[PDB]
Design a protein around this motif. Structure first.
Motif, PDB file in Angstrom:
ATOM      1  N   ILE A 150      -1.194   4.284  -9.504  1.00  0.00           N
ATOM      2  CA  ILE A 150      -0.502   4.389 -10.782  1.00  0.00           C
ATOM      3  C   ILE A 150       0.848   4.991 -10.584  1.00  0.00           C
ATOM      4  N   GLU A 151       0.628   6.257 -10.168  1.00  0.00           N
ATOM      5  CA  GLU A 151       1.899   7.189 -10.220  1.00  0.00           C
ATOM      6  C   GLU A 151       2.843   6.833  -9.141  1.00  0.00           C
ATOM      7  OE1 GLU A 151      -1.318  10.272  -9.469  1.00  0.00           O
ATOM      8  OE2 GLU A 151       0.037  11.789 -10.110  1.00  0.00           O
ATOM      9  N   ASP A 152       4.090   6.591  -9.191  1.00  0.00           N
ATOM     10  CA  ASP A 152       5.026   6.178  -8.450  1.00  0.00           C
ATOM     11  C   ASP A 152       5.839   7.443  -7.660  1.00  0.00           C
ATOM     12  OD1 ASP A 152       5.428   3.096  -8.045  1.00  0.00           O
ATOM     13  OD2 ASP A 152       5.299   3.363 -10.273  1.00  0.00           O
ATOM     14  N   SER A 153       5.600   8.455  -8.178  1.00  0.00           N
ATOM     15  CA  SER A 153       6.248   9.906  -7.713  1.00  0.00           C
ATOM     16  C   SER A 153       5.407  10.740  -7.265  1.00  0.00           C
ATOM     17  CB  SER A 153       7.432  10.248  -8.610  1.00  0.00           C
ATOM     18  OG  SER A 153       7.041  11.146  -9.525  1.00  0.00           O
ATOM     19  N   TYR A 154       5.299  11.928  -6.328  1.00  0.00           N
ATOM     20  CA  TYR A 154       4.409  12.553  -5.978  1.00  0.00           C
ATOM     21  C   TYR A 154       5.326  13.786  -5.538  1.00  0.00           C
ATOM     22  CZ  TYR A 154       1.246   8.630  -6.280  1.00  0.00           C
ATOM     23  OH  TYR A 154       0.662   7.821  -6.727  1.00  0.00           O
ATOM     24  N   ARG A 155       4.779  15.084  -5.661  1.00  0.00           N
ATOM     25  CA  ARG A 155       5.234  16.307  -5.168  1.00  0.00           C
ATOM     26  C   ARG A 155       4.223  17.195  -4.742  1.00  0.00           C
ATOM     27  NH1 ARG A 155      10.566  18.400  -5.995  1.00  0.00           N
ATOM     28  NH2 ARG A 155      10.430  20.634  -6.202  1.00  0.00           N
ATOM     29  N   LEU A 190      -2.091  10.744   1.228  1.00  0.00           N
ATOM     30  CA  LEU A 190      -1.554  11.852   2.010  1.00  0.00           C
ATOM     31  C   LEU A 190      -1.850  13.063   0.883  1.00  0.00           C
ATOM     32  CD1 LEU A 190       0.509  12.983   4.023  1.00  0.00           C
ATOM     33  CD2 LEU A 190       2.343  12.559   2.067  1.00  0.00           C
ATOM     34  N   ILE A 191      -1.400  12.832  -0.443  1.00  0.00           N
ATOM     35  CA  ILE A 191      -1.323  14.101  -1.580  1.00  0.00           C
ATOM     36  C   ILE A 191      -2.699  14.337  -1.861  1.00  0.00           C
ATOM     37  CG2 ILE A 191      -0.011  14.631  -3.523  1.00  0.00           C
ATOM     38  CD1 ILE A 191       1.711  14.486  -1.180  1.00  0.00           C
ATOM     39  N   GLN A 192      -3.586  13.320  -2.358  1.00  0.00           N
ATOM     40  CA  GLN A 192      -4.542  13.642  -3.230  1.00  0.00           C
ATOM     41  C   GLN A 192      -5.811  13.369  -2.355  1.00  0.00           C
ATOM     42  OE1 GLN A 192      -4.192  11.261  -6.886  1.00  0.00           O
ATOM     43  NE2 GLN A 192      -2.284  12.189  -7.092  1.00  0.00           N
ATOM     44  N   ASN A 193      -5.615  12.841  -1.118  1.00  0.00           N
ATOM     45  CA  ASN A 193      -6.845  12.926  -0.061  1.00  0.00           C
ATOM     46  C   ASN A 193      -7.886  11.874  -0.593  1.00  0.00           C
ATOM     47  OD1 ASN A 193      -5.737  15.007   1.354  1.00  0.00           O
ATOM     48  ND2 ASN A 193      -6.107  16.072  -0.078  1.00  0.00           N
ATOM     49  N   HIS A 194      -7.700  10.704  -1.144  1.00  0.00           N
ATOM     50  CA  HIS A 194      -8.523   9.816  -1.534  1.00  0.00           C
ATOM     51  C   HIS A 194      -8.148   8.412  -1.424  1.00  0.00           C
ATOM     52  CE1 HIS A 194      -7.453   9.201  -5.963  1.00  0.00           C
ATOM     53  NE2 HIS A 194      -6.992  10.366  -5.732  1.00  0.00           N
ATOM     54  N   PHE A 195      -8.990   7.299  -1.768  1.00  0.00           N
ATOM     55  CA  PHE A 195      -8.637   5.927  -1.704  1.00  0.00           C
ATOM     56  C   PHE A 195      -9.596   5.090  -2.569  1.00  0.00           C
ATOM     57  CE2 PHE A 195      -9.504   1.679  -0.263  1.00  0.00           C
ATOM     58  CZ  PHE A 195      -7.973   0.953  -0.465  1.00  0.00           C
ATOM     59  N   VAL A 196      -8.863   4.434  -3.628  1.00  0.00           N
ATOM     60  CA  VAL A 196      -9.817   3.637  -4.386  1.00  0.00           C
ATOM     61  C   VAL A 196      -9.132   2.311  -4.444  1.00  0.00           C
ATOM     62  N   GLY A 236       1.011  -1.241   0.071  1.00  0.00           N
ATOM     63  CA  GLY A 236       0.002  -0.059  -0.037  1.00  0.00           C
ATOM     64  C   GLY A 236       0.864   1.182  -0.130  1.00  0.00           C
ATOM     65  N   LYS A 237       2.159   1.126  -0.614  1.00  0.00           N
ATOM     66  CA  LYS A 237       2.950   2.238  -0.678  1.00  0.00           C
ATOM     67  C   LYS A 237       2.061   3.675  -1.591  1.00  0.00           C
ATOM     68  CE  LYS A 237       6.338   0.083  -2.536  1.00  0.00           C
ATOM     69  NZ  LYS A 237       5.487  -1.231  -2.442  1.00  0.00           N
ATOM     70  N   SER A 238       1.711   3.110  -2.621  1.00  0.00           N
ATOM     71  CA  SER A 238       0.906   3.935  -3.438  1.00  0.00           C
ATOM     72  C   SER A 238      -0.213   4.511  -2.879  1.00  0.00           C
ATOM     73  CB  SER A 238       0.781   3.718  -5.093  1.00  0.00           C
ATOM     74  OG  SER A 238       2.014   3.181  -5.636  1.00  0.00           O
ATOM     75  N   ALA A 239      -0.993   3.806  -2.288  1.00  0.00           N
ATOM     76  CA  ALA A 239      -2.096   3.929  -1.637  1.00  0.00           C
ATOM     77  C   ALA A 239      -2.105   5.165  -0.234  1.00  0.00           C
ATOM     78  CB  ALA A 239      -3.109   2.921  -1.074  1.00  0.00           C
ATOM     79  N   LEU A 240      -1.075   4.992   0.315  1.00  0.00           N
ATOM     80  CA  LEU A 240      -0.724   5.685   1.491  1.00  0.00           C
ATOM     81  C   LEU A 240      -0.352   7.081   0.809  1.00  0.00           C
ATOM     82  CD1 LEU A 240       1.289   3.434   3.771  1.00  0.00           C
ATOM     83  CD2 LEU A 240      -0.735   4.676   4.232  1.00  0.00           C
ATOM     84  N   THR A 241       0.687   7.225  -0.276  1.00  0.00           N
ATOM     85  CA  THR A 241       1.055   8.461  -0.610  1.00  0.00           C
ATOM     86  C   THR A 241      -0.159   8.957  -1.365  1.00  0.00           C
ATOM     87  OG1 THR A 241       2.924   7.285  -1.086  1.00  0.00           O
ATOM     88  CG2 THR A 241       3.043   9.523  -1.796  1.00  0.00           C
ATOM     89  N   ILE A 242      -1.058   8.423  -2.276  1.00  0.00           N
ATOM     90  CA  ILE A 242      -2.151   9.168  -2.585  1.00  0.00           C
ATOM     91  C   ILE A 242      -2.920   9.704  -1.736  1.00  0.00           C
ATOM     92  CG2 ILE A 242      -4.203   8.853  -3.877  1.00  0.00           C
ATOM     93  CD1 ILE A 242      -2.368   6.388  -5.477  1.00  0.00           C
TER      94      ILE A 242
END
Ligand SMILES: Nc1nc2c(ncn2[C@@H]2O[C@H](COP(=O)(O)OP(=O)(O)O)[C@@H](O)[C@H]2O)c(=O)[nH]1
Length: 163
Positions: A31-36, A23-29, A15-21
């Protein structure tokens, strides 16, 4: 503006992507591996530059760069994935090697805490984090439990390191 380069490491599917999404995008469903993104942590404006990696992806040169310049690391396992917990030691050892340091800011993260299937006890995880001398935070990318705390705690570990 202070920038923090963060790397989220752990086995595929924890759940690395899910955790970061979350945090950054404030949702859960489910793809992206990098975030800023710029956030405010304890009143300090911080740009978070984040890579999620299991260490098995095609862009190895980019991974090594982020690993070398990463200022803090989330070590993520899932509470319903014993193998992912067992993998944590490998990831920590790899970070220590590439950073060539014994004092690298890290936080141990036990994700998927909302799920009723558990094969890793909270005690096991706490005991491991204690051995490493790092915080342990239980998270759920689904319910948002612990998500801000995990990343913000890491940023605080980085600040303590730079002091
Ligand atoms: N129930 C639950 N599912 C999760 C959680 N985090 C991730 N998932 C699911 O686990 C699967 C793998 O997640 P993903 O973010 O792609 O893992 P990654 O390979 O570590 O980036 C996906 O189906 C996610 O929806 C969580 O905290 N709770």
């Amino acid at each position: 503006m202070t920038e923090y380069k963060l790397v989220v490491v752990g086995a595929c599917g924890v759940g690395k992507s899910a955790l970061t999404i979350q945090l950054i995008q404030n949702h859960f469903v489910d793809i992206e591996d990098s975030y800023r993104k710029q956030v405010v942590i304890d009143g300090e404006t911080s740009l978070l530059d984040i890579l999620d990696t299991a260490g098995q992806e095609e862009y190895s040169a980019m991974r090594d760069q982020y690993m070398r310049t990463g200022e803090g690391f989330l070590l993520v396992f899932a509470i319903n994935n014993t193998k992912s917990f067992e993998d944590i030691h490998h990831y920590r050892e790899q970070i220590k090697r590439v950073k060539d340091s014994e004092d690298v800011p890290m936080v141990l993260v036990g994700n998927k805490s909302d799920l009723p299937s558990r094969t890793v006890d909270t005690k096991q995880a706490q005991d491991l984090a204690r051995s490493y001398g790092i915080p342990f935070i239980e998270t759920s990318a689904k319910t948002r439990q612990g998500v801000d705390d995990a990343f913000y705690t890491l940023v605080r570990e980085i600040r303590k390191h730079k002091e």
